Structure formats: structure tokens, C-alpha cells
Design a binder for this molecule. Sequence first.
Ligand code: CMP
Ligand code: CA
Ligand code: YB
Ligand code: YB
Ligand code: YB
Lengths: 143, 481
Amino acid sequence: TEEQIAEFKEAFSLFDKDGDGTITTKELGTVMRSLGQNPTEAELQDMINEVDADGNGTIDFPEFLTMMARKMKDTDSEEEIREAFRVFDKDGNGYISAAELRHVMTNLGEKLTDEEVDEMIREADIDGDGQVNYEEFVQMMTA
Amino acid sequence: RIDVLKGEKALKASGLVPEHADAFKKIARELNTYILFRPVNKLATNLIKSGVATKGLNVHGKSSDWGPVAGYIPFDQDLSKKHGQQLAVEKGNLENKKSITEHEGEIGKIPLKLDHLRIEELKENGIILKGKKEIDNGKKYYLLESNNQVYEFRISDENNEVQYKTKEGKITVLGEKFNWRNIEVMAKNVEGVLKPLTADYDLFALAPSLTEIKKQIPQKEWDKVVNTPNSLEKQKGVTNLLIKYGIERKPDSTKGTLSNWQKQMLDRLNEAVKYTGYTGGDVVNHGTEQDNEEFPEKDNEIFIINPEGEFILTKNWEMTGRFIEKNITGKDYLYYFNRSYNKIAPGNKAYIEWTDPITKAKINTIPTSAEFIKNLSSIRRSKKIAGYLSDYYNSANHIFSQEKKRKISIFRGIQAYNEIENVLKSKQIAPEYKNYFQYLKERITNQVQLLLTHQFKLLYKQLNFTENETDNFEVFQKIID
Ligand SMILES: Nc1ncnc2c1ncn2[C@@H]1O[C@@H]2COP(=O)(O)O[C@H]2[C@H]1O
Ligand SMILES: [Ca+2]
Ligand SMILES: [Yb+3]
Ligand SMILES: [Yb+3]
Ligand SMILES: [Yb+3]
């Protein structure tokens, strides 16, 4: 899509005294992290070393804007997910609650122990309010 | 309670052929899934019962609800229900032109032939009346009457083909004035002969029981993520199975954009009708309205067949959405709403509102980094804060206890409230962005002040103002309790 492109650019103005957009492979992810997907140092050494590999690995626009074209492709979710959320959230509170997850699980076929449910909420929980807000459900679903 | 129509009074108001709406309860109760249809041109009903073929996706010509061509799809879409709005009619045509040309063979057009039996039907619904006897160049006609102020029609006593002209003086939407010519209607090629098209059934939505999506998931593929030793990603695998066999809808090419439990559904519905003797192929034939994002449509009445075989008919959008809220999205059934709701649909500039729970709870939740970039994105008409946000939501808190979680987060939360103040106090750059950081504040504020609502109401004019590193987090250690 278009928006799944226009966004990216904004990142190219965060932290790089290169001026004319030019970071490195020693601070590339610093952008992807702050953005979406989150790969490891192992999935960052061979992806980059392919398209633009001269001497100092020039990093700019026609590059990154291209890398995501395959990583941020099959995982074109975000939508395929934000709706998963609305499913567990039968209350409409905006956040998933212990119960909310049980009700959904006890129907997909797996009778969950009143213990586990409360453990899946806690682990999935990040800000620690006792329930998962959309943002958390996102994180919990990718990172 | 809600002011809704139940029973026959609804089926009757749905336009759905009664004998079919009946066959539908069958599948509604059988598959424990609600089946909601959008309207259906009523003058199209008996035509469908009659057996008239229904338009697919290669025909986007709106049918007519008036005149003798009422029921069928006039090739001249100025005879269809859009009769009047120019840009509309203009698009109606092009769409039909694309049908005839882009599909030479499958789609075409035949002349309108109303028989002694359809004249009557139209007569009762008070659509057109058989008038005088006119004689033009050796052939007899009967002026077909209509409350219309632009065209005039007739039928031949010979072949029964209807013709029409623009009345004297009056002018067509386009600027055309012509004389006695045939009303052509969109056809479909079936076995070498050309047959006429008519309104199909438009699913507004399909909501199965969550218990139903199970049967869709392979009793293998499930046990894996289920019996996962973990208890973290184990949820992800559960949700992601829900997402695959529950949602991520794809192009069929002909059926539109639907899922696989929807494609299977469609067939069940059509098998149903065919068993009632409907000679004319499929009746329901492209995916549901919730996947129609480009040109979404809001109707005032949605016919509903619940998993109990009952007939409801919401009377207004405010209702149709209140129903689904209470009976479907909050009762353990799978339901999703059009991606282009609450947005400005691109294709038709449509603005359909719907309650999205994720938005309600927004003024109390602080944005992730990406969310913060996107927010920086689509506002670029004319820094470093993204960090303190990828800090708040650090998926690696999964080892901490709520007590700790609520703390470092309350901190990381005020951390950002800082950078988002070092700006509103800096150069005035753009009043467009300033009206955003204000939001963040109120948001960033509200969430923190919600966590602390366990242990603050002004504890900020003291805490670390301006130093840095790890000592700051130390001072906080006590500012708390
Ligand atoms: N995947 C889809 N699912 C449901 N409706 C769709 C889909 N794609 C398009 N629609 C449409 O919304 C319109 C409703 O009128 P039609 O059925 O004649 O033509 C339809 C398309 O323009
Ligand atoms: Ca939480
Ligand atoms: Yb249709
Ligand atoms: Yb349709
Ligand atoms: Yb349709």
C-alpha cells in the first residue's frame, strides 16, 4: 500500500548526524526497532549484505524502503490482527481481561484452568495494569 | 429492547424470496452462524423466484426499481434506480460498457420483453400500467404508463419488446433527446442463448460461533500451539490460528474478497436455494459487505437470520450496529467490521461510522513508537521520543512482577512526558504538530495517573527535572512510596 510506505520516511530524521540520510549497519535496526518488526543481529547481517554492499554499505531510501518489501510482506498483518483483538474483547472496554481470554479459549476448544488464564494475561501484560491494551496485543503478537 | 421488525413483516421487508429465506434458516441454525443480508430490490424478488439469473461481479449495473424495466438492469442506467444523478448514471453506464466489452461472450444485452404475466406483476406493485392502443408503421403498440416525467414507453403486440423515448421538450440527464428505441437489459450467456440478469443477494456480514471456527482448524496443527510447554507465545499461536482459519480474507477472483469459511458458506447457501427448485444458478455470489472497503454502503435495514432461524430487521444503522454489538460481537461469535469504517473510504469518499473498542480506550493508553511515527506520517501536510515509547512497551518485562512493571513503566512514561515538553517549550514550529503533543501529554498523563491509582496527583514538580543516566531512576525509587 501507500501508507505502508509514507510512514517509514519519518524515521529518516531521528538520530543520524549524517545529514542527507545516511546511517549504518551499526544503527540500522535502531530505526526498525523504533518502527515495526524486530529481528535479531543474525537476520540483519545477511539481509543488508545483498542489495547495497560497496565499501561502507551506503544506507538510504531506495534501500530500506525495499528491504521491508519482503519482510513486511507476508506479515502484512496489523489489520489481520487489530481485528483479532476486537474478538477477545467482547466487553468493549478497549482492553483484554483475564475472563475475556478464557471465554474465547474455552470455545476454540481448550478448557483453560482459571490459573493459566491469569498467567497468560500477566505475561502478555507489559505496562502491568492487569489487562492487555491493543498496543500490548500488537507487541505480544510480533516482537 | 430495540425497535426491530421480527417475523414475516421482516422477510417481507428484506426483499429476499420467501421460499429461500426459509431454506436459509436451515443453514443459519445448522451452522450456528448469523446470516445478515443487505436489502434486495423488491421488484427483483418474483423475478428471482421466477428463475431470472442474478448479476455477479462482472455486472455492476444497478438494477431498476421503477418503470417497465424495473427489476432488471437497464443498459441505459438512467432507467435504473439512479435515474437522475448524472455522475451516478454516467458511472452506471461505463460499468455496463465494461461488462459488454471486457467480457464479450459471458455478458451481453437483450431487448426487454415483458409478458402478459410480468405486466400484471408490475401492475399490482403499481409500477406501470398498460394503456391505449398506438399504431406506428404497420405494427401495434400499447403505451406503457409510468409516473415518470422524462420518458415514454410501449410494448409490441407482436414480440412483447418494450421501447422508450424522451418526452417532447424534456431532456435526458446527459443532454440526449431521442425517439422510440428499445430498452436494452444486461444479459448473461447460458448455453449459447442470452438470458437476462437481475439483483443478487448481498451478504452484509457472516458471523459464526467461535466454537464453529474450531472445526475449521486441523485437529493437529492446533494441538501443537495448544500443548506448547510455554505459556507466552502459546497465546500467539492460538490467536494466529484464529487469524488464519478465522480471518485473513483473500481474492477469489469472481467471488470477491472473502475467507474460506465464507467461500464454503456461500456454497451451502446456494445449494440450499437450488434444492428449492431455483433454475438459474447461484443466488448469493460475491463475499460479504464487510470486505467491501473501496465502495462501502450504509443501508437503513439489514435482514438477519440468527442461528435460531428467527427473522429480525434492524430499522436503522444506529440499530443494525447496536444489534451486532449486543447479539454478535459480545456473545462469542466471530465478527469483523469493514476496514474502511470510521475512515474516508477511498473509492466513494464514503464516511461510515462504527464503534471501534480500540479507540474508546485510547485517551488512557499511551502510543507505541511506530504508532508515533505513523502519527508523524499522515500529518506531513507541510525526535528521540519514539524511544521512551519503545521503552514503555518493552516486551521484555515478561520477567517482572506487576509491582515492578507498573513502576518502570510509570517512569518510562514520565520519561517521554519530558521530551514531549522540551518541545512545546521550544521554538513554535507548527501549530499543527503542537495540537498533537498536547494530546500525547493528556494521554501520557492519563495512563501514568492510572497506574499510580494503585499507590501521586502532582508528584512531578520535584522528581528528576534535568540530569541524566541511571541515578535518576534512583531518586524515583523513593519519590514513589
Ligand atoms: N470482496 C467483496 N465483498 C463484498 N462486496 C464486495 C467485494 N468487492 C467488491 N464488493 C462490492 O460492493 C458492490 C455491491 O454491488 P455489487 O454487488 O453489484 O457490486 C459490488 C462491488 O462493487
Ligand atoms: Ca497492560
Ligand atoms: Yb448484486
Ligand atoms: Yb453484492
Ligand atoms: Yb452483489
